[PDB]
Amino acid sequence: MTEYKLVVVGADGVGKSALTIQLIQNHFVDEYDPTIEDSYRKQVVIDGETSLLDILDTAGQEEYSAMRDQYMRTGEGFLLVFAINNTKSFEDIHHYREQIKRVKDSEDVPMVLVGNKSDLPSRTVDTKQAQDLARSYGIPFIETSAKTRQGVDDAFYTLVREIRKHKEK
Ligand SMILES: C#Cc1c(F)ccc2cccc(-c3ncc4c(N5C[C@H]6CC[C@@H](C5)N6)nc(OCC56CCCN5CCC6)nc4c3F)c12
Ligand SMILES: Nc1nc2c(ncn2[C@@H]2O[C@H](COP(=O)(O)OP(=O)(O)O)[C@@H](O)[C@H]2O)c(=O)[nH]1
Ligand SMILES: [Mg+2]
């Protein structure tokens, strides 16, 4: 039985809270307070190992206190979430990835790129763009919908697998 500190990051409105609540509660919450940063545990067996996932759903004002750096540094893996209907959210991925690298003092931090809202037709970010970005970062890319649950388990479980591989490097 292993505990993992997972962190869900990305722009406002991409679906970080909806993704987190899908994983923990198996339903789509269409109104989660956009300002509230909170954490939740999900206990699940992944490839045979009981796993305690402690998931930080980030939110709130953009601030860079030394305390926030130290706290983010304890994250073991990060979901880099953008929404496929929001180009700005995709462009902001670089910032979140660099802040993770900045506080972890490492070029090899477990991360997964997540293209959320894949149920919507109003796509402005191409799947190929996202694949090219994830390839350039050396990380997996997973398409999700918090609305339908498409890809949600895959995104979190792939992140756990990336942490396990990191531990063995
Ligand atoms: C997350 C995280 C985070 C890490 F993953 C790792 C280490 C970190 C260390 C220190 C701090 C953070 C961190 N905390 C909050 C951030 C944030 N807010 C404001 C909005 C957007 C998401 C949510 C929180 N509510 N916003 C932006 O950036 C928004 C934009 C993008 C370009 C700069 N900035 C200008 C306006 C748009 N960055 C953030 C940020 F880095 C860390
Ligand atoms: N259609 C669709 N809407 C979504 C999805 N994920 C989130 N939303 C909606 O997008 C809005 C922002 O989601 P939220 O989880 O609050 O994003 P956060 O700011 O990143 O926590 C809400 O109206 C959600 O219901 C999704 O996968 N599909
Ligand atoms: Mg939220």
Curated annotation (Swiss-Prot):
User: Is Ubl conjugation included in the keywords of this UniProt record?
Assistant: yes
Substituting Q61L results in: Promotes GTP binding
Q: Which residues are glycosylated?
A: T35
Under InterPro entries, the record lists: P-loop_NTPase (IPR027417), Small_GTP-bd (IPR005225), Small_GTPase (IPR001806), Small_GTPase_Ras-type (IPR020849)
Q: Please give the activity regulation comment for this entry.
A: Alternates between an inactive form bound to GDP and an active form bound to GTP. Activated by a guanine nucleotide-exchange factor (GEF) and inactivated by a GTPase-activating protein (GAP). Interaction with SOS1 promotes exchange of bound GDP to GTP.
Q: Give the enzyme's EC designation.
A: 3.6.5.2
Which CDD domains does the protein's record reference?
A: H_N_K_Ras_like
Q: Does the keyword Glycoprotein apply?
A: yes
Q: What is the effect of changing Q22R?
A: In NS3; impairs GTPase-activating protein stimulated GTP hydrolysis with unaffected intrinsic functions and a virtually functional effector interaction
Where does this protein hold GTP? 10-18, 29-35, 59-60, 116-119
Which positions bear N6-acetyllysine? K104
Q: Where in the cell is it found?
A: Cell membrane; Endomembrane system; Cytoplasm, Cytosol
The principal localisation class reads: membrane
Q: Which GO terms describe its cellular component?
A: cytoplasm; cytoplasmic side of plasma membrane; cytosol; endoplasmic reticulum membrane; focal adhesion; Golgi membrane; membrane; mitochondrial outer membrane
N-acetylmethionine modification sites? M1
Its catalytic activity?
Answer: GTP + H2O = GDP + phosphate + H(+)
- Report the PTM annotation: Acetylation at Lys-104 prevents interaction with guanine nucleotide exchange factors (GEFs).
Pfam families listed in its UniProt record: Ras
Described purpose of this protein according to its UniProt entry:
Ras proteins bind GDP/GTP and possess intrinsic GTPase activity. Plays an important role in the regulation of cell proliferation. Plays a role in promoting oncogenic events by inducing transcriptional silencing of tumor suppressor genes (TSGs) in colorectal cancer (CRC) cells in a ZNF304-dependent manner.
Q: Which family does it belong to?
A: Belongs to the small GTPase superfamily. Ras family.
Protein name (Swiss-Prot/TrEMBL): GTPase KRas
| Organism per entry | Homo sapiens (Human)
The lineage, from the top, is: Eukaryota, Metazoa, Chordata, Craniata, Vertebrata
